[PDB]
Design an enzyme around this catalytic site. Structure first.
Site, PDB file in Angstrom:
ATOM      1  N   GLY A  29       0.813  -1.222   0.000  1.00 50.58           N
ATOM      2  CA  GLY A  29       0.000   0.000   0.000  1.00 50.58           C
ATOM      3  C   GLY A  29       0.844   1.267   0.000  1.00 50.58           C
ATOM      4  N   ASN A  30       0.223   2.389  -0.371  1.00 50.37           N
ATOM      5  CA  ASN A  30       0.788   3.729  -0.128  1.00 50.37           C
ATOM      6  C   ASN A  30      -0.290   4.742   0.311  1.00 50.37           C
ATOM      7  OD1 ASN A  30      -0.311   4.496  -2.680  1.00 50.37           O
ATOM      8  ND2 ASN A  30       1.672   4.379  -3.735  1.00 50.37           N
ATOM      9  N   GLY A  31       0.159   5.939   0.667  1.00 51.67           N
ATOM     10  CA  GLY A  31      -0.700   7.044   1.082  1.00 51.67           C
ATOM     11  C   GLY A  31       0.135   8.293   1.308  1.00 51.67           C
ATOM     12  N   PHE A  33       1.169   9.512   4.159  1.00 55.54           N
ATOM     13  CA  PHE A  33       2.208   9.055   5.110  1.00 55.54           C
ATOM     14  C   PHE A  33       3.540   8.584   4.485  1.00 55.54           C
ATOM     15  CE2 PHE A  33      -0.676   5.343   4.467  1.00 55.54           C
ATOM     16  CZ  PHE A  33       0.229   4.370   4.028  1.00 55.54           C
ATOM     17  N   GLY A  34       3.454   7.905   3.333  1.00 53.10           N
ATOM     18  CA  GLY A  34       4.590   7.209   2.704  1.00 53.10           C
ATOM     19  C   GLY A  34       4.138   5.902   2.056  1.00 53.10           C
ATOM     20  N   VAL A  35       4.658   4.770   2.556  1.00 54.17           N
ATOM     21  CA  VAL A  35       4.514   3.441   1.914  1.00 54.17           C
ATOM     22  C   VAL A  35       4.447   2.299   2.956  1.00 54.17           C
ATOM     23  CG1 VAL A  35       7.046   3.335   1.506  1.00 54.17           C
ATOM     24  CG2 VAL A  35       5.520   1.914   0.110  1.00 54.17           C
ATOM     25  N   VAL A  36       3.705   1.232   2.624  1.00 50.65           N
ATOM     26  CA  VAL A  36       3.553   0.007   3.455  1.00 50.65           C
ATOM     27  C   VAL A  36       4.077  -1.221   2.677  1.00 50.65           C
ATOM     28  CG1 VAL A  36       1.949  -1.434   4.828  1.00 50.65           C
ATOM     29  CG2 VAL A  36       1.468   0.984   4.479  1.00 50.65           C
ATOM     30  N   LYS A  51       5.102  -0.456   7.982  1.00 47.57           N
ATOM     31  CA  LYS A  51       4.696   0.912   7.636  1.00 47.57           C
ATOM     32  C   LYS A  51       5.900   1.867   7.694  1.00 47.57           C
ATOM     33  CE  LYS A  51       1.488   4.636   8.885  1.00 47.57           C
ATOM     34  NZ  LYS A  51       0.068   4.879   9.265  1.00 47.57           N
ATOM     35  N   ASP A 147     -10.818   6.614  11.902  1.00 46.70           N
ATOM     36  CA  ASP A 147     -10.747   6.029  10.555  1.00 46.70           C
ATOM     37  C   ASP A 147     -11.231   4.567  10.493  1.00 46.70           C
ATOM     38  OD1 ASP A 147     -10.469   6.203   7.784  1.00 46.70           O
ATOM     39  OD2 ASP A 147      -8.315   5.768   7.806  1.00 46.70           O
TER      40      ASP A 147
HETATM   41  C1  LIG Z   1      -4.424  -7.207  -4.811  1.00 44.97           C
HETATM   42  O1  LIG Z   1      -3.500  -7.621  -3.785  1.00 44.97           O
HETATM   43  C2  LIG Z   1      -3.833  -7.134  -2.506  1.00 44.97           C
HETATM   44  C3  LIG Z   1      -2.799  -7.608  -1.514  1.00 44.97           C
HETATM   45  N1  LIG Z   1      -3.257  -7.460  -0.123  1.00 44.97           N
HETATM   46  C4  LIG Z   1      -4.004  -8.640   0.322  1.00 44.97           C
HETATM   47  C5  LIG Z   1      -4.659  -8.388   1.677  1.00 44.97           C
HETATM   48  C6  LIG Z   1      -3.602  -8.085   2.741  1.00 44.97           C
HETATM   49  C7  LIG Z   1      -4.241  -7.756   4.083  1.00 44.97           C
HETATM   50  N2  LIG Z   1      -3.277  -7.317   5.096  1.00 44.97           N
HETATM   51  C8  LIG Z   1      -3.090  -6.030   5.408  1.00 44.97           C
HETATM   52  O2  LIG Z   1      -3.505  -5.096   4.720  1.00 44.97           O
HETATM   53  C9  LIG Z   1      -2.328  -5.757   6.693  1.00 44.97           C
HETATM   54  N3  LIG Z   1      -1.884  -6.731   7.493  1.00 44.97           N
HETATM   55  N4  LIG Z   1      -1.266  -6.100   8.545  1.00 44.97           N
HETATM   56  C10 LIG Z   1      -1.312  -4.744   8.425  1.00 44.97           C
HETATM   57  C11 LIG Z   1      -0.834  -3.717   9.234  1.00 44.97           C
HETATM   58  C12 LIG Z   1      -1.051  -2.404   8.831  1.00 44.97           C
HETATM   59  C13 LIG Z   1      -1.732  -2.099   7.637  1.00 44.97           C
HETATM   60  C14 LIG Z   1      -1.969  -0.688   7.219  1.00 44.97           C
HETATM   61  C15 LIG Z   1      -3.242  -0.335   6.753  1.00 44.97           C
HETATM   62  C16 LIG Z   1      -3.512   0.962   6.334  1.00 44.97           C
HETATM   63  C17 LIG Z   1      -2.531   1.941   6.391  1.00 44.97           C
HETATM   64  C18 LIG Z   1      -1.280   1.594   6.851  1.00 44.97           C
HETATM   65  F1  LIG Z   1      -0.299   2.523   6.895  1.00 44.97           F
HETATM   66  C19 LIG Z   1      -0.992   0.306   7.255  1.00 44.97           C
HETATM   67  F2  LIG Z   1       0.253   0.023   7.681  1.00 44.97           F
HETATM   68  C20 LIG Z   1      -2.204  -3.152   6.841  1.00 44.97           C
HETATM   69  C21 LIG Z   1      -2.002  -4.476   7.228  1.00 44.97           C
HETATM   70  C22 LIG Z   1      -2.673  -6.977   2.232  1.00 44.97           C
HETATM   71  C23 LIG Z   1      -2.153  -7.212   0.813  1.00 44.97           C
END
Ligand SMILES: COCCN1CCC(CNC(=O)c2n[nH]c3ccc(-c4cccc(F)c4F)cc23)CC1
Length: 350
Positions: A29-31, A33-36, A51, A147
């Site tokens: 992910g990104n936003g 904030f930066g990148v995940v 994160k 959120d």
């Molecule tokens: C199409 O492919 C999609 C790939 N997708 C599959 C589902 C999978 C689910 N897992 C997570 O999203 C996850 N698990 N632990 C986390 C801890 C923190 C965060 C997080 C969320 C929002 C903003 C942030 F800054 C964050 F760090 C997300 C997660 C992810 C990848």
């Protein structure tokens, strides 16, 4: 695949930094904030989320200080944190190492919705209950998440454990100290925030949670506004126009939208014919205009909608036992300790 080794500090306990190695880094992910990232820890093989955020060297990170004080089974755990440098001078990144969870409520709900299917009510109960637990816990510290939406509700499909994540918008709310009104994701945004309230409470998360419940029962977002202002219009189409008393209870900074009067749509007609009455009832006590009229997260956990979860013969559809729903600490009961008799049934008492 190339290994990265860092000296990272544990999220809980005193500052005792340790060498931590990881590999198989990929952007997920990104936003703003930066990148995940996803990554795999070399020693244990366990997957983690990382994160990465650009952090000023002088000023302390609000999300880090909140994450270091939280320890709860329905909240994503801060395993470690570390700092990494940038190309430019005085360019430091904070890196939060969080546990990886393979699914989200968003993704699961969308699976059912694309196949023209409703999520079974057992999962609705399980996921919402664990959300209200996560909220009962954070609210007892005065922390408001700000959120709450399906994408920030992580889940393990095999165990049905729900973990609340993304504390980037979260804040210690202090009475008499203002807060920004343009906050939360639009569809889940409480009406007081749309009216420009800067003195609001943790009940904004309860509104957001109500929107999640309704979404899981409908198969789609209940209030899909195409802008910040049209969001109020969508809310009005179900709840009706708020009265001046209700507008006053929301603590507005502006009330000059000039909306025409609309009657309330009865809650039974919003949802499907076969929607359980207790689900509708719970939803009516979450999606209230008057913020103080909303149930607390602990009262919500005690609602009759979650009685099936307290029945000793309950199991998951995959055969396995339910997760730990009743191990309530004194901290998480602190808002209303007499609710323990309802929340901890006979078979779960210690
Ligand atoms: C199409 O492919 C999609 C790939 N997708 C599959 C589902 C999978 C689910 N897992 C997570 O999203 C996850 N698990 N632990 C986390 C801890 C923190 C965060 C997080 C969320 C929002 C903003 C942030 F800054 C964050 F760090 C997300 C997660 C992810 C990848």
């Amino acid at each position: 695949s190339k290994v990265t080794t860092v000296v990272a500090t544990p999220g809980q306990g005193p500052d005792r930094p340790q060498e931590v190695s990881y590999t198989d880094t990929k952007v997920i992910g990104n936003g703003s904030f930066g990148v995940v990232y996803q990554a795999k820890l070399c020693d244990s093989g366990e997957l983690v989320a990382i994160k990465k955020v650009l952090q000023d060297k002088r000023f302390k990170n609000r999300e880090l200080q909140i994450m270091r004080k939280l320890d709860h089974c329905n909240i994503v755990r801060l395993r470690y944190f570390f700092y990494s440098s940038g190309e430019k001078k005085d360019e430091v990144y904070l890196n939060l190492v969080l546990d990886y969870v393979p699914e989200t409520v968003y993704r699961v709900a969308r699976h059912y919705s694309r196949a023209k299917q409703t999520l079974p009510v057992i999962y609705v109960k399980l996921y919402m209950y664990q959300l209200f637990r996560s909220l009962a816990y954070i609210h007892s510290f005065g922390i408001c998440h700000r959120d709450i939406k399906p994408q920030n509700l992580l889940l393990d499909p095999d165990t049905a454990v729900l973990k609340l994540c993304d504390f980037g918008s979260a804040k210690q709310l202090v009475r008499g100290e203002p807060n920004v009104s343009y906050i939360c994701s639009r569809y889940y945004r409480a009406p007081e925030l749309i009216f420009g309230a800067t003195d609001y409470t943790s009940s904004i998360d309860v509104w957001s949670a109500g929107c999640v419940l309704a979404e899981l029962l409908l198969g789609q977002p209940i209030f899909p506004g195409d802008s910040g202002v049209d969001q109020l219009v969508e809310i009005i189409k179900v709840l009706g126009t708020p009265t001046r008393e209700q507008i006053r209870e929301m603590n507005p900074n502006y009330t000059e939208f000039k909306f025409p009067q609309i009657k309330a749509h009865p809650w039974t007609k919003v949802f499907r014919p076969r929607t359980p009455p207790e689900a509708i009832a719970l939803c009516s006590r979450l999606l209230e205009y008057t913020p103080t009229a909303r149930l607390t997260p602990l009262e919500a956990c005690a609602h009759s909608f979650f009685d099936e979860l307290r029945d000793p013969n309950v199991k998951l559809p995959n055969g396995r036992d339910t997760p730990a729903l009743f191990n309530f600490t004194t901290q998480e009961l602190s808002s209303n300790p007499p609710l323990a008799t309802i929340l901890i049934p006979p078979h779960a008492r210690i």
